[PDB]
Amino acid sequence: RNLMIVDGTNLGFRFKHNNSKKPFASSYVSTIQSLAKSYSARTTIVLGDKGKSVFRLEHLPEYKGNRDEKYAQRTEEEKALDEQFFEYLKDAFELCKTTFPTFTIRGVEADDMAAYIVKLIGHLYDHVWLISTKGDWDTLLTDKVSRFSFTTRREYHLRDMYEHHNVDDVEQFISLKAIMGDLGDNIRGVEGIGAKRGYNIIREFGNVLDIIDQLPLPGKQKYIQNLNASEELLFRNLILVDLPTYCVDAIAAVGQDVLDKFTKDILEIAE
Ligand SMILES: [Cl-]
Ligand SMILES: [Cl-]
Ligand SMILES: [Cl-]
Ligand SMILES: [Mg+2]
């Protein structure tokens, strides 16, 4: 009765250390099978990353530049080990494809594919279970869309949004992420705004688009002065973090034909 969407590269890292040394294709597929039973998945779709986010790099050339730097500073042995891991992950994906619908699209993040699948076919299922450790995927939560993380073991539901993310709803989460950015993705945020302040700002003035319309905001605090100077950053960050709004555009960035093919494939699966 449910749809299960697997963040497949993310799952591969589950046992990254182990998965770099010995082949894991059979274990990988049996994990997905176990998850599908646990979550009563009538349909299971596995996603992988391939290349870099063309859409996000066009908006922010420095996007995930910290991650690129780390890869570039690997020792030759670290790199070989990673190359081994990715060869094993490729084998895992190939085996996976024999059993489950499995997609990679060069230049498109798994995030965008997942968001688009939920939009396109989520209505056909009782519940949608997202298998990912990425907090960014909680921009997709609803009354009928939840996430499971293998690292934390938590099942993430919309009703628990404040516990998880210091906001009450997805619109707020998206706006807060835009305001705060993310060090890990090399996305700058507005100086002096923590989760508390940001939530309070959103509850006062509205979402980031509403905030932008009201600049300059009243208030003497330095973090308000910082916000008032940040129209460009806020608008760009919203594009970078608002998965539901931009997921179609992010797929279309690599070719309308590629988006059309993906749409066709997903609708076939859901029939
Ligand atoms: Cl590599
Ligand atoms: Cl700032
Ligand atoms: Cl704060
Ligand atoms: Mg991110």
Would you kindly provide a written description of the structure presented here, covering whatever features stand out?
This is Flap endonuclease. Keywords: DNA replication, DNA-binding, Early protein, Endonuclease, Exonuclease, Hydrolase, Magnesium, Metal-binding, Nuclease, Potassium, Viral DNA replication. The chain has helices spanning 8-12, 16-21, 25-38, 54-59, 65-72, 76-99, 110-121, 161-165, 170-180, 195-205, 208-214, 222-228, 231-241, 243-252, 256-270; strands at residues 2-7, 41-47, 102-103, 128-131, 145-148, 155-156. It is an alpha/beta fold and 271 residues long. Helix 3 (25-38) packs across helix 6 (76-99), helix 7 packs across helix 14 and helix 9 packs across helix 13 (231-241). It starts with a strand and ends with a helix. The chain has two domains: 1-160 and 242-267, Rossmann fold; 162-241, 5' to 3' exonuclease, C-terminal subdomain (DNA polymerase, domain 1). It is built from 15 helices and six strands. The chain has a six-stranded mixed β-sheet, with helices on both faces. The chain binds chloride ion (3 copies) and magnesium ion.
Ligands bound, unique: chloride ion, magnesium ion
| Radius of gyration (Å) | 19 Å
- CATH-defined architecture of the largest domain: 3-Layer(aba) Sandwich
Straight-line distance between termini: 13 Å
Strand content: 5-15%
How many independent structural domains? Answer: 2
Number of helices: 15
How many E-type strands?
6
- Please name the fourth-level CATH homologous superfamily of the largest domain: 5'-nuclease
Sheet with the most strands: spatial strand order? 3-2-1-4-5-6
Helix content: 55-70%
Give me the strand/helix succession: EHHHEHHHEHEEEHHHHHHHH
* Shape call: globular
Question: Which structural class matches the secondary elements?
Answer: alpha/beta
Which CATH class of the largest domain?
Answer: Alpha Beta
Largest sheet: 6 strands, mixed
Query: What is the CATH topology assignment of the largest domain?
Result: Rossmann fold
Pfam families: 5_3_exonuc, 5_3_exonuc_N
Binding site for Mg(2+) 3: 136, 182
GO molecular function: 5'-3' DNA exonuclease activity; 5'-3' exonuclease activity; 5'-flap endonuclease activity; DNA binding; DNA exonuclease activity; double-stranded DNA 5'-3' DNA exonuclease activity; double-stranded DNA endonuclease activity; metal ion binding
Binding site for DNA: 64
